[PDB]
Design a protein around this ligand. Structure first.
Ligand code: HEM
Ligand code: HEM
Ligand SMILES: *[C@@H]1O[C@H](CO)[C@@H](O[C@@H]2O[C@H](CO)[C@@H](O)[C@H](O)[C@H]2NC(C)=O)[C@H](O)[C@H]1NC(C)=O
Ligand SMILES: *[C@@H]1O[C@H](CO)[C@@H](O[C@@H]2O[C@H](CO)[C@@H](O)[C@H](O)[C@H]2NC(C)=O)[C@H](O)[C@H]1NC(C)=O
Ligand SMILES: CCCCCCCCO[C@@H]1O[C@H](CO)[C@@H](O)[C@H](O)[C@H]1O
Ligand SMILES: CCCCCCCCO[C@@H]1O[C@H](CO)[C@@H](O)[C@H](O)[C@H]1O
Ligand SMILES: CCCCCCCCO[C@@H]1O[C@H](CO)[C@@H](O)[C@H](O)[C@H]1O
Ligand SMILES: O=C(O)Cc1ccc(-c2ccccc2)c(F)c1
Ligand SMILES: O=C(O)Cc1ccc(-c2ccccc2)c(F)c1
Lengths: 552, 552
């Protein structure tokens, strides 16, 4: 009915209905013109000749290790390149934000209401004859069957890129501060109104909660000492709400800022490390500033950890999963003479794409043990029995699963994978190819092109009929990996623009904030600018054990 | 005790304490260096030699009317100048925002908590030996006495620039969508979490309230017809909360989106004009889009009125109060190849400075009548007796009061002016000169330099002792007006940057919003781009009366 159901406008133009059966595309600044913004301006025709595909660019970034070794040690050049990844990537995100679940047209409600996840592509309207607009059958293929046929794990597939459980739980930890779906509202509503990296998962989303978590001496965060070691305080002692099953004794009900991190010892590990680090930085800042009271130590410490997180997140975490020989850099200055919006809103598709469960193994191997999922969940005594050092040691050693490539979602969390498919459809996501187009990628012309193989591809073809009706989420986990990599094209290309904007749009990266005094002077800034995963762990975990995001 | 109490750092550098008795200034990007960022870099030395003073620049803009006639008609040039006014002004604002009443250092709480008005200058620490930092006596002069000696009106002083009551109530209507102090919390807290021009004063701050004001047919806003004429609906009918005194009969309890606009007929006049406008735009959009439902008509109309409001605010209202022969322009394209932040946070000092009560006359002269304040307040039957037409006609005719120049606050609102002094102090505002410096203005060296006259200055010198201890608010209203102007240097130079950021920082001005389809196509866009106070009133008031912000 809606004449815009077919998604007729290309190249980021907007469709608009002009009477019941006619539409009109708005091609403003798209670099194109014509009824569907398909015919290019001249300046544009040149750019599309010279623009290397993402796989070409990927090849260059993951070869010529000798040339990158040299380029990484010329500050001038490293700077030039990073700056081009930042500006080129960010330009793919609409900032200020545009759509949500309920608004396929720009609207003030869409813009002002912070409870919604935003949306890189508008939803498909409710009065469209098919779920993906105009193509395909009236119903998408049974979600249970997509799951079973191409998503569930038969035999574990290790990540060829060497990603380990320190990498896997770090993703889970860090992402769970900006992915917090408000299930009472529905999917496509968020409880993280910071829309970015604010460490509410350490410090709490609300002031009331933050105050319960705080000691009010020396800027510090309450804690308890068990054995010789520092752990987070109890629910009983603090009264902060936490989600624990009823059978959990009150001495193991740990209170951290994210009410869910009790659920997996992996989370609670990072949760403990970051608590120690906040209190660590407090001791440093008190020494530099005997004149400072508790508020200032506390707030400056938080600002410091916000900094460390973005540093660690770019130069270690993204660095590792990217596979690049070029050394990525966290440097706000790169964007000070560039056009850039220091603001962010987390996008449904980003949450959707970040469901990286195939990372998880069959068993969690800590020390001499192999814990099943059943044994591991909601079981913090494991963390206590072995201790942080042994966790970091064992999780550095244990290989994680490959995400793309298909058939590596562990059965233990099949519910979770099916929900991901079902909720995508509930939120009226557009098709895989509409998302590829949106991030400057060649649509897939067949399923065997998508998967790079014959069997999963043939299964998918019997289920969806047309490639243009294939869905994003399943496509991401089934896609052909890059050679010996954990991810395919689509995952990298959608992910990177969401990721770096969330990181660089933070206000501490803005000119007026990025200066020593914001962080308690030059010794405070240094903590940010020398941050790493090794030193985060070294300074906070007994015996400075080796870690990495990578198996050795 | 705080070694930063003296505000030692100059040129926008930040003070930091390094032990109990020593401080350090961080000069990053200030264009200066040294212990107090006083000694200029070379490139800076050149700029301060070529930089005209604001009163020089004011002279050029308000003279040579023959040269401007030509410049206003060369689109190339008008664009170049307006772009320079936008970028040069905006640069004086910190965006993302920095401080509030409770935070004199950068902090995540200051940045994330949208309940606070932000703050162009840090509050004076609580352990400073004096109310301005270190200068003056332990107490500021008795506020009642400052009020009575230099602020209260003896004889009505008309504005020399011709500002009339359409102007005065327009300033009132428009600003009360972003100045909404949360008195329960304290001053320095705001109830407008939009921090800008979102027309909540028309549509309501919350969804719950907005829905009660809506008709849910053709995107329209509920209304009633009394006499022939369209007015806003009642509280009885809609259930929206309004502030009315207990003696107000239910038929006169109009429900608008801002709960206070019941208390002055002037507000309720504009309140009605915009209501009509919103519904006028709905009929137009309905005609262009018979396929459109109620939500989209309603949201698209609101986007258009956000656009009209910014257009009129720049090209008519500011235009008039500026006194420039140069014709200011609303065109978001100007900023598309510029560094600019499409976000805003309204500032205490902006709210403080915008307390323009001297505008108000001794009597409100509608038609053949002269209503006292007591007769006018909370009395909408006056609005009903005369009708919108006679309001517009009479308010176009009646001069408003001069704001600067001293002694023009009408006795009827003396409470308000004293409050204003008291709450500045309560919020720990810095002195007049620290603000002057902060906006690139020569500190006043004497009181008589400030006032331009002897008598008020003498009185001020008896009360405050030192000019560096003079307060901002009083000084704005007692300042030497520009020749035959409503305002002094300090008002214009503080106001203009806060104003143009609020206007241009709105999202509709951003590349991704500013295109016809956002506004329902080319005809929708045209409403924005041809908007003016004359046509806002012509299209919506019986008999297309002439208006202006200026007496004829
Ligand atoms: C033992 C480890 C883990 C368990 C038991 C687990 C389980 C879950 C469950 C039950 C949900 C709820 C979603 C729903 O159905 O509504 C979820 C959400 C999610 N998970 Fe996994 N997960 C694990 C590790 C991970 C890891 C390693 C990643 C890597 C990034 C990840 C990414 C996500 C994301 C992005 C969400 C969405 C969160 C939200 O919407 O708030 N989780 N996890
Ligand atoms: C008959 C006309 C008016 C009356 C009776 C009036 C009265 C007041 C009163 C009683 C307050 C509250 C102050 C406090 O809470 O301590 C106020 C606030 C204010 N007024 Fe006036 N006023 C009038 C016209 C104006 C006009 C023409 C302007 C022009 C801009 C203006 C600007 C302000 C501002 C900016 C505030 C602060 C708003 C806030 O606290 O959020 N008012 N008005
Ligand atoms: C923003 O800050 C205000 C003030 O700091 C917060 O309100 C205070 O809230 C606490 C609850 O933690 C109350 O105990 C105080 O009485 C409040 N003070 C005042 C004067 O309002 C408010 O909660 C914060 N807003 C957000 C969104 O966190
Ligand atoms: C943001 O939007 C949501 C939903 O559109 C608002 O919550 C709705 O609020 C109304 C009341 O105004 C309730 O009747 C609905 O049940 C809510 N729906 C959902 C799914 O939550 C929310 O209040 C809006 N945010 C703001 C700041 O107004
Ligand atoms: C020469 C090697 C350096 C590569 C730097 C760019 C890294 C990411 O480059 C990506 O490539 C794609 C195709 O060109 C574009 O669509 C993305 O926007 C672009 O950011
Ligand atoms: C070509 C003459 C028109 C110049 C337009 C500038 C109008 C306001 O320009 C202002 O001038 C002040 C003094 O230089 C500065 O303090 C402000 O930053 C600047 O925006
Ligand atoms: C009208 C409100 C009371 C003001 C008078 C008492 C405060 C002192 O006001 C006096 O009035 C004269 C004109 O008003 C001036 O010439 C004096 O300098 C002034 O101080
Ligand atoms: O632009 C780049 O190539 C760097 C990069 C930056 C971020 C990511 C990423 C992708 C998905 C999720 C999280 C981060 C990435 F895969 C690569
Ligand atoms: O930059 C300019 O010169 C234009 C200008 C822009 C804004 C204002 C202003 C000042 C005070 C309050 C409201 C607007 C003004 F008086 C002038």
């Amino acid at each position: 009915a809606n004449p815009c159901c077919s998604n007729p406008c290309q190249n980021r133009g907007e469709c608009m209905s002009t009477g019941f059966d006619q539409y009109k595309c708005d091609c403003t600044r798209t670099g194109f013109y014509g009824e569907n913004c398909t015919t290019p301006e001249f300046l544009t025709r040149i750019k599309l000749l010279l623009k290397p595909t993402p796989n070409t660019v990927h090849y260059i970034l993951t070869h010529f290790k000798g040339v990158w070794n040299i380029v990484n040690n010329i500050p001038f050049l490293r700077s030039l390149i990073m700056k081009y990844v930042l500006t080129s990537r960010s330009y793919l995100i609409d900032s200020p934000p545009t759509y949500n679940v309920h608004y396929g047209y720009k609207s003030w409600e869409a813009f002002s209401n912070l409870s919604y996840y935003t949306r890189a592509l508008p939803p498909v309207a409710d009065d469209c004859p098919t779920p993906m607009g105009v193509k395909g059958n009236k119903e998408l293929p049974d979600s249970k069957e997509v799951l079973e046929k191409v998503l569930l794990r038969r035999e574990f597939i290790p990540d060829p890129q060497g990603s380990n459980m320190m990498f896997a739980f770090f993703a889970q930890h860090f992402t769970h501060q900006f992915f917090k779906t408000d299930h009472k509202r529905g999917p496509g509503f968020t409880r993280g109104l910071g829309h970015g990296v604010d460490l509410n998962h350490i410090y709490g989303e609300t002031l009331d909660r933050q105050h319960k978590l705080r000691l009010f001496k020396d800027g510090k965060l309450k804690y308890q000492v068990i054995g010789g070691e520092v752990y987070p305080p109890t629910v009983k002692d603090t009264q902060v709400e936490m989600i624990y099953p009823p059978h959990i004794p009150e001495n193991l009900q740990f209170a951290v800022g994210q009410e869910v991190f009790g659920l997996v010892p992996g989370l609670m590990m990072y949760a403990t490390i970051w608590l120690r680090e906040h209190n660590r930085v407090c001791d440093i800042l008190k020494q530099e500033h005997p004149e400072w009271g508790d508020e200032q130590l506390f707030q400056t410490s938080r600002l410091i950890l916000i900094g460390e997180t973005i540093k660690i997140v770019i130069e270690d975490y993204v660095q590792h999963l990217s596979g690049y020989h070029f050394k990525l850099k966290f440097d706000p200055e790169l964007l000070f003479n560039q056009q850039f919006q220091y603001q962010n809103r987390i996008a449904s598709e980003f949450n959707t794409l970040y469901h990286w469960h195939p990372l998880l193994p069959d068993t969690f191997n800590i020390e001499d043990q192999e814990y099943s999922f059943k044994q591991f969940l909601y079981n913090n005594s494991i963390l206590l029995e072995h201790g942080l050092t042994q966790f970091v040691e064992s999780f550095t050693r244990q290989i994680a699963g490959r995400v793309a490539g298909g058939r590596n979602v562990p059965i233990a969390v099949q519910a979770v994978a099916k929900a991901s498919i079902d909720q995508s459809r509930e939120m009226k996501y557009q098709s895989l190819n509409e998302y590829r187009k949106r991030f400057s990628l060649k649509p897939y012309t067949s399923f065997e092109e998508l998967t790079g193989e014959k069997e999963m591809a043939a299964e998918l073809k019997a289920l969806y009929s047309d490639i243009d009706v294939m869905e994003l989420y399943p496509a991401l986990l089934v896609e052909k990996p890059r050679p010996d990599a954990i991810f395919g094209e689509t995952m990298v290309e959608l992910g990177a623009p969401f990721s770096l904007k969330g990181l660089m749009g933070n206000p501490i990266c803005s000119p007026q904030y990025w200066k020593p005094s914001t962080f308690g002077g030059e010794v405070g800034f240094k903590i940010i600018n020398t941050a790493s995963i090794q030193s985060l762990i070294c300074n906070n975990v007994k015996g400075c054990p080796f870690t990495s995001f990578n198996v050795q």
